[PDB]
Amino acid sequence: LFGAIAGFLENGWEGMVDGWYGFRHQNAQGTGQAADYKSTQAAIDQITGKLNRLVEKTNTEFESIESEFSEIEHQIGNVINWTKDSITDIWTYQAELLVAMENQHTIDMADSEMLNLYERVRKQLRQNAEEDGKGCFEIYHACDDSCMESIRNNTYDHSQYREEALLNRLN
């Protein structure tokens, strides 16, 4: 479990059908919402991988050992009932585990991609911002809508606004 999705973020946003992970900013120029293409697609490309893996099951040709329209001798019949059933039991255990285990990875995978986006912005914001407990960054220099485009863009040059922010954090 990574810290984020059932964690320090309160809840998901239903209002975001745009993609799986997204930004919401509140500056002087109103508020906006946009979804990060990079991070959802990391997750989506992994979920679709697990789907390819499950359906890639080339198999053996199996022939009939149980007569559907006639009896077979009791002794062999009971061996065939015992084996067939014992394979099903193995194969039912194998499925029930495949899924539990593929699901635990799937939530936790998606949970990580969130934190990776969180860290990705945190590190990029450098000294110009701080984190509250929820998934927010209080940005301590005045933010243009263009600069916000720039934080998602991964192009935000922290050193530009560094002195402005660094003062506001202190005064």
Binding site: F62, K84, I107
Partner: protein, 318 residues
């Protein structure tokens, strides 16, 4: 001023099972256990035989139901529930071993044994039990040998069949068991009946048994059927006093095919690689709940109504 990171959620989500939580709610999910199948035998791509009311054992003896299916090729042979094999009452020895051999083949060829009998023998016996065209008849690959002259001892006769082919031939004969001594006498005589069959890979003796049994199809006499594989270059022979229902043809099971036992109709335009007695199974999922008994390349049967695979993150609504 402020910037925030979030994930999406949906109004009404799905539930899946995980390692630690039976009840864990994700946004999206697809099934991994296929629940619906097709009620058709999807045979596009297959050279197949729908046997109808023919039972694969019928093919070898040429029962009247089976006349359309005496020879041919397939890569898939479909046996049905109302299947007739015998038309005169009787049984077959190792009938399931035998059956399965045919159900695994890619076809049959028939080969004449060429057996010829004396003047003392009428090889043409027929019965009200096997009908072709409102008329008494008999199995197409056997010949009921009885005395031409009633009550006379069926002559001591010796027939030999040589397999000069390159593969193994399946050959069948019947041993007749009369319903009474009035009868056992009229066909074969008062003499002791004996039937010795010989190969390099088989030797056995049969003796017609007289006894009253229930009447079936009207009759209290039976026909027991027998078989063995005759190797290439191998000869097989019959010593018979009377009672042998000899073969007029032998079978050669060619190639490899795929025995489907099923109740569903045929679709020569739908394409499939997995069958159950209900029809076919065209799915991409790894598992299915439809039937424990399946034939061909199949997803494995599991005992669960449903199995859901998360395909989205944990769902946390507002």
């Amino acid at each position: 001023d402020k910037i925030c990171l979030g994930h999406h959620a949906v109004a009404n989500g799905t539930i899946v099972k995980t390692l630690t939580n039976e009840q864990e709610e994700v946004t999206n999910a697809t099934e991994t256990v296929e629940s619906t199948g097709i009620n058709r035998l999807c045979m596009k791509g297959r050279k197949h035989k729908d046997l109808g009311n023919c039972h694969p054992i019928g093919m070898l003896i040429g029962t009247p139901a089976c006349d359309l299916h005496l020879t041919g090729m397939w890569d898939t042979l479909i046996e049905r529930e109302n299947a007739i094999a015998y038309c005169y009452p009787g049984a077959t020895v190792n009938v399931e071993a035998l059956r399965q051999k045919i159900m695994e083949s890619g076809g049959i060829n028939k080969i004449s044994t060429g057996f010829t009998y004396g003047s003392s023998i009428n090889s043409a016996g027929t019965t009200r039990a096997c009908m072709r065209n409102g008329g008494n008849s008999f199995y197409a690959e056997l010949k009921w040998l009885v005395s031409k002259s009633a009550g006379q001892n069926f002559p001591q006769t010796t027939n030999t069949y040589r397999n000069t082919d390159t593969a193994e031939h399946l050959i069948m004969w019947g041993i007749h068991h009369p319903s009474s001594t009035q009868e056992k006498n009229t066909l074969y005589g008062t003499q002791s009946l004996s039937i010795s069959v010989g190969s390099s890979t088989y030797r056995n003796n049969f003796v017609p048994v007289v006894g009253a049994r229930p009447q079936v199809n009207g009759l209290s006499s039976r026909i027991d059927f027998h078989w063995t594989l005759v190797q290439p270059g191998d000869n097989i022979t019959f010593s018979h006093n009377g009672g042998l229902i000899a073969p007029s043809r032998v079978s050669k099971l060619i190639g490899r095919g795929l025995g489907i036992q099923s109740d569903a109709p045929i679709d020569n335009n739908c394409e499939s690689k997995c069958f159950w007695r209900g029809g076919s199974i065209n799915t991409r999922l790894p598992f299915q709940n439809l039937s424990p008994r399946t034939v061909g390349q199949c997803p494995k049967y599991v005992n669960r109504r449903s199995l859901m695979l998360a395909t989205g993150m944990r769902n946390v609504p507002e």
